[PDB]
Structures are given as C-alpha cells and as structure tokens.
Amino acid sequence: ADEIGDAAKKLGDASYAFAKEVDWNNGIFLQAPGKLQPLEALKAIDKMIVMGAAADPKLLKAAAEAHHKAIGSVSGPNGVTSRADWDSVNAALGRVIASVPENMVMDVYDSVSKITDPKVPAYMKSLVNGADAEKAYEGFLAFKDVVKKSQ
Amino acid sequence: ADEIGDAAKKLGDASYAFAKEVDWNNGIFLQAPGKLQPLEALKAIDKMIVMGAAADPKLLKAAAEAHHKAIGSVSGPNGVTSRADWDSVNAALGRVIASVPENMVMDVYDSVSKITDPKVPAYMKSLVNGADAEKAYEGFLAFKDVVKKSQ
Ligand SMILES: CCCCCCCCCCCCCCCCCC(=O)OC[C@H](CO[C@@H]1O[C@H](CO[C@H]2O[C@H](CO)[C@H](O)[C@H](O)[C@H]2O)[C@H](O)[C@H](O)[C@H]1O)OC(=O)CCCCCCCCCCCCCCCCC
Ligand SMILES: CCCCCCCCCCCCCCCCCC(=O)OC[C@H](CO[C@@H]1O[C@H](CO[C@H]2O[C@H](CO)[C@H](O)[C@H](O)[C@H]2O)[C@H](O)[C@H](O)[C@H]1O)OC(=O)CCCCCCCCCCCCCCCCC
Ligand code: CL7
Ligand code: CL7
Ligand SMILES: CC(=O)O[C@H]1CC(C)(C)C(=C=C/C(C)=C/C=C/C=C/C=C(C)/C=C2C=C(/C=C/[C@@]34O[C@]3(C)C[C@@H](O)CC4(C)C)C(=O)O/2)[C@](C)(O)C1
Ligand SMILES: CC(=O)O[C@H]1CC(C)(C)C(=C=C/C(C)=C/C=C/C=C/C=C(C)/C=C2C=C(/C=C/[C@@]34O[C@]3(C)C[C@@H](O)CC4(C)C)C(=O)O/2)[C@](C)(O)C1
Ligand SMILES: CC(=O)O[C@H]1CC(C)(C)C(=C=C/C(C)=C/C=C/C=C/C=C(C)/C=C2C=C(/C=C/[C@@]34O[C@]3(C)C[C@@H](O)CC4(C)C)C(=O)O/2)[C@](C)(O)C1
Ligand SMILES: CC(=O)O[C@H]1CC(C)(C)C(=C=C/C(C)=C/C=C/C=C/C=C(C)/C=C2C=C(/C=C/[C@@]34O[C@]3(C)C[C@@H](O)CC4(C)C)C(=O)O/2)[C@](C)(O)C1
Ligand SMILES: CC(=O)O[C@H]1CC(C)(C)C(=C=C/C(C)=C/C=C/C=C/C=C(C)/C=C2C=C(/C=C/[C@@]34O[C@]3(C)C[C@@H](O)CC4(C)C)C(=O)O/2)[C@](C)(O)C1
Ligand SMILES: CC(=O)O[C@H]1CC(C)(C)C(=C=C/C(C)=C/C=C/C=C/C=C(C)/C=C2C=C(/C=C/[C@@]34O[C@]3(C)C[C@@H](O)CC4(C)C)C(=O)O/2)[C@](C)(O)C1
Ligand SMILES: CC(=O)O[C@H]1CC(C)(C)C(=C=C/C(C)=C/C=C/C=C/C=C(C)/C=C2C=C(/C=C/[C@@]34O[C@]3(C)C[C@@H](O)CC4(C)C)C(=O)O/2)[C@](C)(O)C1
Ligand SMILES: CC(=O)O[C@H]1CC(C)(C)C(=C=C/C(C)=C/C=C/C=C/C=C(C)/C=C2C=C(/C=C/[C@@]34O[C@]3(C)C[C@@H](O)CC4(C)C)C(=O)O/2)[C@](C)(O)C1
Ligand SMILES: [Cl-]
Ligand SMILES: [Cl-]
Ligand SMILES: [Cl-]
Ligand SMILES: [Cl-]
Ligand SMILES: [Cl-]
Ligand SMILES: [Cl-]
Ligand code: NA
Ligand code: NA
Ligand code: NA
Ligand code: NA
C-alpha cells in the first residue's frame, strides 16, 4: 500500500461518475484530436517513447496488468470498467508518472497540446455531465499533488 | 551481440528497399484496418497488453530506446529511418518477441487478423514495389526462424 493508492481512491470518488458517462465505444477516439499532423504527432510520440524508456519497468508491467484486469470487468452500454479497476488503473498510472523526471512528463503534455485542437476539450465535455467532468478534474488536481510528492 | 542481431542484419538487406517505399507520413495508418469494431479491437489490444506484461522489461526498454534513436534519423520525403536504425528496431523487437511464450504472440496475430479487412494487405502492397514487398516478407520468414530458436 502507498500514498498514491490512497489518493487514487479519493480520485475515484471524484471521477467515477464521469467515467460512467463517457461512451468508451465511440469511434471518435481513433481520430486525430483536430487536424492530422504526422510530423508534429511523431514529435509527441517521441516524447512518450522517451518517457516509457525512463519509467520504472516493474511499474510499467504493473500498469499493463491493471489494464488487462480492467478490460475484464467492462460492463454496461458505455464500456466502463468497475469502480475498483478504475482506481487500480489510476494508481498504477500515478506510480509510473512518479517514476520519471517531471520535465519528461511536461514534454509529453506540451507536445500533445500542440496537436490538439482547442475545441476538443469542450466537445468531449459536452458529451458528459459538465458538473461531473469538473468534479473529476478537481479530483485529478488533488491526485497529482500526491503523485508529485512521490516523484 | 546475439543471433537475433545477426538475423536483423540479413532481414535489413531483404527489407530496407521496401521500408524506403512506404510513405510513413500517410494518414491512413490512423484508420481502423477495415471497419471500426471497438469490442473486437479491445479484444486484440487486451492480447497485446497481456503480451507486454509478459515480455522481458529490460528488452521492452531497449526496444523503446531503439525507436527513439530511429525517430532521430528520419530523412527524405517518406519519413524512413536510417538503414542502421531499421536493423536496430527489428532486432530489438525480435528480442521482445522471443521473450514471451509463442501462444501469446499467436493470440495477438489471430486477434488482429479478426479485425483486418482482407483487402488491406493488397492495398498496402499496391503502394510499394510488389517485388520489394515480397523480398521483405521472405526476409521476415527467415528472421522469425532465428527468433523462434531464441524463444
Ligand atoms: C496510430 C498511432 C496511435 C497513437 C495515438 C496517440 C493519441 C494522441 C492524442 C489524443 C489526446 C488528446 C485528446 C483529449 C484532450 C484531453 C485533455 C483535456 O481536455 O484538457 C482540458 C484542459 C482544460 O484546460 C485546463 O483548464 C483548467 C480549468 O480550471 C478551472 O476550472 C476547473 C473546473 O473544475 C477547476 O475548478 C480548476 O481549479 C479551475 O482553475 C485550468 O485553466 C488549466 O490551467 C487548464 O490547463 O486543457 C489542457 O490541459 C490543454 C492541453 C491539452 C492536452 C491534451 C492531452 C493531455 C496531454 C497528455 C495526454 C497524454 C498522452 C495522450 C496520448 C495517449 C496516452 C497513452
Ligand atoms: C486509439 C488506439 C490506437 C491502437 C491501434 C492498434 C492498431 C491495430 C491494427 C493495425 C494492423 C493491421 C494492418 C496491416 C496488416 C499487415 C499484415 C499483413 O499484411 O500480412 C499479409 C499476410 C499475407 O498472408 C500471408 O501470405 C503468405 C504468402 O506467402 C507466399 O508468397 C510469399 C511472397 O514473397 C513468399 O514467397 C512465401 O514463402 C509464400 O508461401 C502465406 O500464404 C501466408 O500463410 C499468409 O499468412 O496476411 C496475414 O498475415 C493475415 C493476417 C493479417 C494480420 C494483420 C496484422 C499482423 C498481426 C499482428 C500485428 C501486430 C499488432 C499490430 C498493431 C500495432 C503493433 C504495435
Ligand atoms: C500501461 C500502459 C497503458 C495501457 C495498456 C493503456 N493506457 Mg491509457 N489512456 C486512455 C485510454 C486507454 C484505453 C481505452 C486503453 C485500453 O486498454 C488504455 N488507455 C490502455 C485515455 C482516456 C487517456 C489519453 C487521452 C486523454 O487524456 O483523455 C482524457 C483523460 C481521461 C478521460 C482519463 C481520466 C483522467 C482524469 C483522472 C479524470 C478526468 C479529468 C478531466 C475531465 C479530463 C482530462 C484532463 C487532463 C488535463 C488530465 C489515457 C492516458 C494514458 C496515460 C498513460 C501513461 C496511459 N494511458 C497508459 C496506458 C495518460 O497520461 C493518459 C491520460 O489520461 O492523460 C490525462
Ligand atoms: C517498443 C514498443 C514500440 C514502439 C515505441 C513502436 N513500435 Mg511498432 N509497428 C509499426 C509502426 C510504428 C511506428 C510508426 C512507430 C513510431 O514510433 C512505432 N511502431 C513504435 C507498424 C509498421 C507495425 C504494425 C502494423 C503492421 O504490422 O504493418 C506491417 C509491418 C511492417 C511494415 C513492419 C516491417 C515488417 C517486416 C519486417 C517487413 C515487411 C513484411 C511484409 C511485407 C508485411 C508484414 C507481414 C506480417 C505478417 C509480418 C508495427 C509493429 C510493432 C510490433 C511491436 C511489438 C512494436 N511495433 C512495438 C513498438 C509488431 O509486431 C508490429 C509488426 O510489424 O507486425 C508485423
Ligand atoms: C498496440 C496497442 O495495443 O497499443 C495500445 C497503446 C496504448 C498507449 C497502450 C493505448 C492507449 C491509449 C490511447 C492511444 C489513447 C488515445 C486517446 C485519444 C483520444 C482522442 C480524441 C479525444 C479525439 C477527438 C477527435 C475529435 C474531433 C473533434 C472535431 O472534429 C469534430 C467532431 C468536428 C469539427 O468541426 C471540430 C472538432 C470538435 C475539432 C474530438 O473531440 O476528440 C491502447 C489503447 O492500449 C492501445
Ligand atoms: C518500454 C515501453 O514499452 O514503453 C511504452 C510504455 C507506454 C506506457 C505503453 C507508452 C506510453 C505512453 C506514455 C509515456 C504516455 C504519457 C502520458 C503523460 C501524461 C501527462 C500529463 C497528463 C501531464 C499534465 C501536465 C499538466 C499540467 C497542468 C497545469 O500546468 C497547467 C496547464 C496550469 C497550472 O496552473 C496548473 C497545472 C494543473 C499544474 C496536466 O494537466 O497534465 C509507450 C510510448 O508506448 C512506450
Ligand atoms: C473501448 C473500451 O471499453 O475501453 C475501456 C478500456 C479500459 C482500460 C477497461 C477502461 C479504462 C480506464 C482508463 C481508460 C483509465 C485512464 C486513466 C488515465 C489516468 C491518467 C493519469 C493518472 C495521468 C497523470 C498525469 C499526471 C501528471 C502529473 C504532473 O504533471 C502534473 C499534472 C503537474 C506537474 O507539476 C507534476 C506532475 C506530477 C508531473 C498524473 O499525476 O496522473 C474503460 C474506461 O473501461 C474503457
Ligand atoms: C484499430 C482499432 O479499432 O482500435 C480501437 C482500440 C480501442 C481501445 C478499442 C478504441 C478506443 C478507445 C479510446 C482510445 C478511448 C479514449 C477515450 C478518451 C476520452 C477523453 C475524454 C472524455 C476527454 C475529456 C476532456 C474533458 C475536458 C473538460 C474540461 O476541460 C474543459 C472543457 C473545461 C473545464 O471545465 C475543465 C475541464 C472539466 C477539465 C472532458 O470532459 O472529457 C477505439 C477508438 O475503438 C479504436
Ligand atoms: C501513446 C503512444 O505513443 O502510443 C504509441 C503506441 C505504440 C504501440 C508504441 C505505437 C505503435 C504502433 C502502431 C499503433 C501501429 C499501427 C499500425 C496501423 C496500420 C494501419 C493500417 C495499415 C490501416 C489501413 C486502413 C486501410 C483502409 C483500407 C480501405 O478503406 C479503403 C482505403 C477503401 C475501401 O474501399 C477498402 C479498404 C482497402 C479496406 C488500409 O489499407 O490500411 C506508436 C505509433 O509508437 C504510438
Ligand atoms: C509493460 C508495457 O508498457 O507494455 C506495453 C508494451 C508495448 C510493446 C508498447 C505494447 C505493445 C504491443 C504488442 C505487445 C504488440 C504485439 C505484436 C505481435 C506481433 C505478432 C506477429 C506479427 C505474429 C505472426 C504470426 C504469424 C504466422 C505466420 C504463419 O503461420 C502462418 C499464417 C501460416 C504458416 O504456414 C506460416 C507462418 C509464417 C508461420 C506472422 O506472420 O506474424 C503495449 C500493448 O502497449 C503494452
Ligand atoms: C511517421 C514516421 O515517420 O514514423 C517513422 C517511425 C520510425 C520508428 C522512425 C520508423 C520505423 C521503423 C519501424 C516502424 C519498424 C517496424 C518494425 C516491425 C518489426 C516487427 C517484428 C520484427 C515482428 C515479429 C513478429 C514475430 C513473430 C514470430 C513468430 O510468430 C511467428 C511468425 C511464427 C511462430 O511460430 C513463432 C514466432 C517466433 C512466435 C517476429 O519474429 O518478429 C519509420 C519507418 O522511419 C517511420
Ligand atoms: C494522433 C496522431 O496524429 O498520431 C499519428 C502517430 C504517427 C506515428 C505519426 C502516425 C503514424 C504512422 C504509422 C502508425 C505507420 C504504420 C505503417 C504500417 C504500414 C504497413 C504496411 C506497409 C503493410 C503491408 C502489408 C503488405 C502485404 C504484402 C503481402 O501480403 C500480400 C498482399 C501478398 C503476398 O505477396 C505476400 C506479402 C508481400 C506479405 C505490404 O506490402 O505492406 C500517424 C498515422 O500519422 C498518426
Ligand atoms: Cl492502505
Ligand atoms: Cl505534418
Ligand atoms: Cl524496478
Ligand atoms: Cl556480431
Ligand atoms: Cl464492435
Ligand atoms: Cl529482465
Ligand atoms: Na522498480
Ligand atoms: Na476486476
Ligand atoms: Na531481462
Ligand atoms: Na541513428
């Protein structure tokens, strides 16, 4: 057990209503988030590959295993995993993020932002309960503060 | 040095002409290979996640690093990496494949086949020199025999 695990449980209280509202079977998530821009996108994927190579390999393995278990508990019409497996996934991903230098995490976020159309966040929020999305985001801000303190 | 490395060099002789002919900047590769089928596709990604969790973590790390180096040597109008980095990537991926039970590799191939339209291979081959694609595939068959002997 660890502090990220405890934090993931609070994050799940704040964000699982939102995860139940996303239609994870929507084909939109295959599309580029805006205009396809292969050279910029490759720049972003390069930042994620650098980060994956820096991350703790045991924690990457645990995060993959958490996703395989989460796929097993998908139910209902939106393809949402169980509450427990949602928390499991979030904690495992928090641990990975805490295992790499903060610059490498920020380089991913900045490089993905560069290819994401400014309309995309509002479009996604429009598909769910806006108050539940805001609740989930405030959850995330609290969770990443625990992540940074392990990092 | 190892036998997969030696095998990757022979594979590169057989397949680098083909890699130079693919337009790696074509946006088609973002599309589903046929009809979008999220539940079947999730089944396939589950097989790949199970395989990623089983793979040797040091060899996964080395394979990520090889891709970051390959991104750095992309040149020309098709986005092809250097000959050296092509071989590097292939060897590193061969090592990963050799680190997991053969059933897990076959489960990925069968699960991806299920979502791939039968026209897709011929469409992709039509974009390159067909003789060079055949040369690359015969290269692959030889390479996977060395991979299986390390597995
Ligand atoms: C064939 C190959 C296949 C490979 C495919 C790879 C896929 C690549 C691309 C897909 C990802 C992008 C799509 C969704 C965007 C979701 C993020 C978002 O909606 O974000 C919404 C935010 C909204 O802006 C925020 O809005 C906030 C609003 O807060 C205010 O209001 C709040 C409301 O509750 C709170 O009260 C809060 O306290 C208060 O201050 C603040 O102003 C913040 O400063 C501001 O950042 O936009 C921002 O962050 C702007 C930056 C957007 C970055 C977008 C993505 C996130 C970055 C890394 C993701 C990792 C990699 C993704 C790839 C796959 C992973 C494996
Ligand atoms: C937002 C989330 C983002 C996530 C996205 C994830 C992406 C997922 C899907 C994309 C991948 C599919 C697209 C391309 C298909 C390419 C494979 C192919 O063209 O294959 C062409 C072959 C042609 O058939 C073969 O054709 C051969 C022809 O050989 C003959 O002719 C030859 C000619 O030289 C030789 O002479 C040879 O000796 C002689 O026997 C034989 O008949 C073989 O038995 C027969 O299998 O088709 C076959 O294999 C049929 C099976 C097709 C399987 C397709 C893919 C390969 C499977 C695993 C790939 C790994 C995962 C991909 C995902 C990403 C990876 C990280
Ligand atoms: C272990 C390796 C791994 C696997 C096997 C895997 N992922 Mg992830 N993965 C996703 C889907 C996915 C699917 C369908 C799936 C199927 O198996 C997987 N993944 C699997 C997307 C939802 C998502 C990429 C697209 C994306 O960012 O969509 C927004 C993210 C969502 C809805 C997840 C929940 C996030 C918060 C807890 C709650 C919501 C807050 C807010 C309202 C919206 C986000 C704001 C943002 C600024 C924080 C994703 C991530 C991400 C990561 C990372 C590191 C991973 N992954 C890793 C993996 C993000 O940072 C990254 C991430 O969330 O960045 C914030
Ligand atoms: C280390 C983790 C990793 C990273 C960071 C990564 N890949 Mg891969 N990755 C690809 C692109 C890619 C890009 C653009 C890219 C950007 O950075 C990356 N990847 C990055 C696609 C070309 C490809 C998935 C789509 C796909 O299969 O397209 C066909 C494959 C090609 C052209 C690669 C060359 C293959 C042969 C040596 C030569 C050609 C023979 C024949 C004419 C056609 C294929 C026949 C097939 C039955 C063998 C891919 C693979 C694959 C794997 C695996 C394990 C990986 N990856 C792994 C990664 C396939 O098995 C898998 C694979 O090749 O299966 C055969
Ligand atoms: C081999 C293998 O298994 O790989 C695995 C690799 C990983 C990394 C482990 C993995 C993973 C995670 C991944 C990739 C996550 C990707 C998330 C992508 C989210 C994409 C989104 C939000 C895309 C869009 C596109 C939109 C388009 C919006 C608009 O165009 C629209 C409508 C109309 C315009 O007028 C205006 C517009 C509003 C602009 C939008 O609003 O959003 C996974 C899945 O496990 C597969
Ligand atoms: C060895 C191997 O196999 O590796 C494989 C391993 C994987 C995992 C499969 C793999 C992969 C994928 C990877 C690495 C994905 C990386 C995800 C990074 C996500 C980063 C995020 C979300 C970062 C941020 C930063 C943010 C900052 C927000 C704020 O600053 C803002 C704006 C304004 C401030 O006022 C407040 C603030 C709130 C501070 C935020 O909001 O989010 C890959 C590439 O395949 C390689
Ligand atoms: C088709 C289908 O059905 O798919 C099904 C597939 C599944 C898997 C079964 C499934 C599921 C679950 C999924 C997708 C869950 C996704 C969870 C994503 C979690 C992401 C996390 C936590 C990312 C981060 C990034 C962080 C960054 C933190 C920092 O940068 C920040 C901010 C500020 C810096 O100063 C300090 C910092 C610390 C560096 C962090 O702290 O955390 C579902 C829903 O059922 C759909
Ligand atoms: C070859 C093939 O077939 O592969 C298949 C493989 C899969 C895995 C099966 C597959 C899949 C599924 C995938 C990747 C699912 C990914 C889902 C990502 C969902 C992202 C969402 C919801 C994003 C947001 C962003 C939001 C932002 C909200 C706010 O910022 C806004 C506006 C303003 C403020 O208020 C604050 C805020 C509240 C922060 C929101 O509210 O939501 C797919 C697509 O089928 C293809
Ligand atoms: C977060 C992050 O960084 O994730 C990283 C995760 C990884 C795994 C590390 C990673 C990787 C590798 C990946 C995903 C490889 C994916 C390869 C996909 C290949 C897709 C192909 C061939 C798609 C098509 C679609 C076609 C459509 C064809 C047709 O419709 C057409 C025209 C007309 C119809 O009449 C008939 C038709 C002919 C049917 C086609 O012919 O082919 C990467 C890139 O590093 C990103
Ligand atoms: C911990 C962590 O981060 O994990 C992350 C790690 C990664 C790597 C990023 C990641 C990923 C992606 C993964 C696992 C991808 C897996 C790729 C598997 C590829 C398998 C292939 C091509 C298999 C085959 C089998 C074939 C058989 C062909 C033949 O039998 C045929 C027909 C007929 C016979 O007569 C002759 C024959 C020739 C014998 C073939 O031709 O090809 C993921 C999911 O994100 C998790
Ligand atoms: C947008 C852009 O510019 O992107 C740029 C991105 C890069 C990275 C810089 C770049 C590049 C290079 C790339 C993509 C290289 C891709 C290489 C893929 C190699 C895949 C390999 C080896 C897969 C396998 C699968 C195997 C399976 C073997 C078996 O199952 C088989 C058969 C039969 C079983 O009985 C026994 C077995 C042993 C189990 C194997 O043995 O090997 C490029 C080109 O520049 C494009
Ligand atoms: C959000 C965002 O923007 O992400 C971006 C991220 C990236 C990485 C920048 C990105 C990218 C690039 C990607 C994934 C590139 C993937 C390329 C895959 C290429 C696959 C090819 C060539 C496949 C084949 C199959 C063939 C088959 C030929 C044969 O079987 C045939 C018919 C018959 C026999 O003769 C034998 C044979 C000879 C075997 C062939 O000949 O070729 C992209 C798309 O821009 C999106
Ligand atoms: Cl506890
Ligand atoms: Cl571009
Ligand atoms: Cl470790
Ligand atoms: Cl040697
Ligand atoms: Cl479906
Ligand atoms: Cl090891
Ligand atoms: Na460790
Ligand atoms: Na479960
Ligand atoms: Na090892
Ligand atoms: Na190089």
PDB file of N, CA, C and O in Angstrom, chain B residues 109-128:
ATOM      1  N   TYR B 109      -1.661 -12.034 -33.123  1.00  0.00           N
ATOM      2  CA  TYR B 109      -1.792 -12.111 -34.587  1.00  0.00           C
ATOM      3  C   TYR B 109      -3.201 -12.523 -35.022  1.00  0.00           C
ATOM      4  O   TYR B 109      -3.769 -11.905 -35.900  1.00  0.00           O
ATOM      5  N   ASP B 110      -3.763 -13.501 -34.324  1.00  0.00           N
ATOM      6  CA  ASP B 110      -5.136 -14.021 -34.628  1.00  0.00           C
ATOM      7  C   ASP B 110      -6.189 -12.956 -34.309  1.00  0.00           C
ATOM      8  O   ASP B 110      -7.162 -12.768 -35.074  1.00  0.00           O
ATOM      9  N   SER B 111      -5.965 -12.220 -33.215  1.00  0.00           N
ATOM     10  CA  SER B 111      -6.971 -11.221 -32.767  1.00  0.00           C
ATOM     11  C   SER B 111      -6.944  -9.973 -33.637  1.00  0.00           C
ATOM     12  O   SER B 111      -7.970  -9.305 -33.786  1.00  0.00           O
ATOM     13  N   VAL B 112      -5.772  -9.653 -34.195  1.00  0.00           N
ATOM     14  CA  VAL B 112      -5.666  -8.502 -35.120  1.00  0.00           C
ATOM     15  C   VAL B 112      -6.206  -8.918 -36.466  1.00  0.00           C
ATOM     16  O   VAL B 112      -6.847  -8.141 -37.169  1.00  0.00           O
ATOM     17  N   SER B 113      -5.882 -10.157 -36.866  1.00  0.00           N
ATOM     18  CA  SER B 113      -6.421 -10.647 -38.143  1.00  0.00           C
ATOM     19  C   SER B 113      -7.971 -10.513 -38.163  1.00  0.00           C
ATOM     20  O   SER B 113      -8.589 -10.157 -39.172  1.00  0.00           O
ATOM     21  N   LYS B 114      -8.603 -10.827 -37.034  1.00  0.00           N
ATOM     22  CA  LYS B 114     -10.053 -10.800 -36.979  1.00  0.00           C
ATOM     23  C   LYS B 114     -10.635  -9.418 -37.338  1.00  0.00           C
ATOM     24  O   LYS B 114     -11.798  -9.340 -37.848  1.00  0.00           O
ATOM     25  N   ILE B 115      -9.879  -8.330 -37.077  1.00  0.00           N
ATOM     26  CA  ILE B 115     -10.414  -7.008 -37.390  1.00  0.00           C
ATOM     27  C   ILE B 115      -9.841  -6.401 -38.681  1.00  0.00           C
ATOM     28  O   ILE B 115     -10.207  -5.263 -39.006  1.00  0.00           O
ATOM     29  N   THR B 116      -8.983  -7.136 -39.400  1.00  0.00           N
ATOM     30  CA  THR B 116      -8.313  -6.569 -40.550  1.00  0.00           C
ATOM     31  C   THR B 116      -9.070  -7.052 -41.786  1.00  0.00           C
ATOM     32  O   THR B 116      -9.160  -8.316 -42.041  1.00  0.00           O
ATOM     33  N   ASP B 117      -9.543  -6.084 -42.556  1.00  0.00           N
ATOM     34  CA  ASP B 117     -10.258  -6.428 -43.833  1.00  0.00           C
ATOM     35  C   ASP B 117      -9.313  -7.163 -44.776  1.00  0.00           C
ATOM     36  O   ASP B 117      -8.134  -6.809 -44.885  1.00  0.00           O
ATOM     37  N   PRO B 118      -9.785  -8.242 -45.446  1.00  0.00           N
ATOM     38  CA  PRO B 118      -8.928  -8.989 -46.378  1.00  0.00           C
ATOM     39  C   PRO B 118      -8.348  -8.166 -47.528  1.00  0.00           C
ATOM     40  O   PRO B 118      -7.326  -8.597 -48.084  1.00  0.00           O
ATOM     41  N   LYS B 119      -8.908  -6.982 -47.849  1.00  0.00           N
ATOM     42  CA  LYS B 119      -8.318  -6.132 -48.878  1.00  0.00           C
ATOM     43  C   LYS B 119      -7.081  -5.336 -48.389  1.00  0.00           C
ATOM     44  O   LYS B 119      -6.345  -4.812 -49.224  1.00  0.00           O
ATOM     45  N   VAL B 120      -6.867  -5.239 -47.069  1.00  0.00           N
ATOM     46  CA  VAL B 120      -5.847  -4.283 -46.574  1.00  0.00           C
ATOM     47  C   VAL B 120      -4.413  -4.672 -47.007  1.00  0.00           C
ATOM     48  O   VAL B 120      -3.677  -3.793 -47.475  1.00  0.00           O
ATOM     49  N   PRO B 121      -4.003  -5.957 -46.900  1.00  0.00           N
ATOM     50  CA  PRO B 121      -2.649  -6.278 -47.316  1.00  0.00           C
ATOM     51  C   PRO B 121      -2.379  -5.905 -48.787  1.00  0.00           C
ATOM     52  O   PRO B 121      -1.342  -5.271 -49.093  1.00  0.00           O
ATOM     53  N   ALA B 122      -3.301  -6.286 -49.674  1.00  0.00           N
ATOM     54  CA  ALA B 122      -3.119  -5.945 -51.101  1.00  0.00           C
ATOM     55  C   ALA B 122      -3.120  -4.450 -51.346  1.00  0.00           C
ATOM     56  O   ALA B 122      -2.387  -3.972 -52.235  1.00  0.00           O
ATOM     57  N   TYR B 123      -3.967  -3.715 -50.622  1.00  0.00           N
ATOM     58  CA  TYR B 123      -3.955  -2.256 -50.775  1.00  0.00           C
ATOM     59  C   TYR B 123      -2.564  -1.689 -50.401  1.00  0.00           C
ATOM     60  O   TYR B 123      -1.950  -0.849 -51.131  1.00  0.00           O
ATOM     61  N   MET B 124      -2.037  -2.098 -49.239  1.00  0.00           N
ATOM     62  CA  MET B 124      -0.701  -1.601 -48.793  1.00  0.00           C
ATOM     63  C   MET B 124       0.355  -2.014 -49.792  1.00  0.00           C
ATOM     64  O   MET B 124       1.172  -1.184 -50.150  1.00  0.00           O
ATOM     65  N   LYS B 125       0.305  -3.263 -50.302  1.00  0.00           N
ATOM     66  CA  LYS B 125       1.353  -3.724 -51.236  1.00  0.00           C
ATOM     67  C   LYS B 125       1.310  -2.933 -52.514  1.00  0.00           C
ATOM     68  O   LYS B 125       2.354  -2.697 -53.184  1.00  0.00           O
ATOM     69  N   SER B 126       0.096  -2.519 -52.870  1.00  0.00           N
ATOM     70  CA  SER B 126      -0.075  -1.756 -54.111  1.00  0.00           C
ATOM     71  C   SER B 126       0.604  -0.405 -54.081  1.00  0.00           C
ATOM     72  O   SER B 126       0.850   0.182 -55.152  1.00  0.00           O
ATOM     73  N   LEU B 127       0.942   0.085 -52.891  1.00  0.00           N
ATOM     74  CA  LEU B 127       1.566   1.406 -52.746  1.00  0.00           C
ATOM     75  C   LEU B 127       3.085   1.357 -52.887  1.00  0.00           C
ATOM     76  O   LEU B 127       3.732   2.404 -53.003  1.00  0.00           O
ATOM     77  N   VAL B 128       3.647   0.149 -52.899  1.00  0.00           N
ATOM     78  CA  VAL B 128       5.110  -0.046 -52.974  1.00  0.00           C
ATOM     79  C   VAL B 128       5.442  -0.927 -54.166  1.00  0.00           C
ATOM     80  O   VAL B 128       4.548  -1.281 -54.955  1.00  0.00           O
TER      81      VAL B 128
END
